[PDB]
Amino acid sequence: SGAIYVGNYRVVNRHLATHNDWANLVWEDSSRDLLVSSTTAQGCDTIARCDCQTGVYYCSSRRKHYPVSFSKPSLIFVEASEYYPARYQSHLMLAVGHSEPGDCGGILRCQHGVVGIVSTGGNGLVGFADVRDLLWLDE
Numbered sequence: 001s002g003a004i005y006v007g008n009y010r011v012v013n014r015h016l017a018t019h020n021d022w023a024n025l026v027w028e029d030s031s032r033d034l035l036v037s038s039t040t041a042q043g044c045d046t047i048a049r050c051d052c053q054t055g056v057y058y059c060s061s062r063r064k065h066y067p068v069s070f071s072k073p074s075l076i077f078v079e080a081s082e083y084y085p086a087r088y089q090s091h092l093m094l095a096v097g098h099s100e101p102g103d104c105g106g107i108l109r110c111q112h113g114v115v116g117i118v119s120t121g122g123n124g125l126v127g128f129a130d131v132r133d134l135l136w137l138d139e
């Protein structure tokens, strides 16, 4: 459960996208587990445009925010699941942190703003879908 509301867009995990998200689809990528749809209202989330590797993420499963050190967006292998077959997910950042399946969508942010959303996790790690390269969300 979680979305980024920037301007006239709504950024969500592709595996949790609703029927309304597909009826107003702007762009989607299975490799990135991202789906951007349109909204009528004007979102106020600031997207970070940077090369940060430290920030704070929100953990629904513990109702706590956590400071984490994270990796550069890369091509990481994600085991098979009930949404996607076993594949390499691109633009993914890993950190040491608690994660549960109901934690997808939780925001990651640095001093500059929103970095990405929780997408993968397991074995003591947590993985984030990066949104800093998507410069069109601001424009």
Ligand SMILES: CSc1cccnc1CC(=O)N1CCC[C@H](C(N)=O)C1
Pocket: 015, 033, 078, 081, 083, 084, 089, 099, 100, 101, 102, 103, 104, 118, 119, 120, 121, 122, 123
């Ligand atoms: C926060 S997700 C999590 C956390 C702890 C343990 N297992 C998970 C589950 C997970 O990693 N998923 C399931 C949903 C689809 C994901 C994907 N991008 O393909 C992979």
Ligand SMILES: [Zn+2]
Pocket: 048, 049, 050, 051, 052, 110, 111, 112, 113
């Ligand atoms: Zn930053």
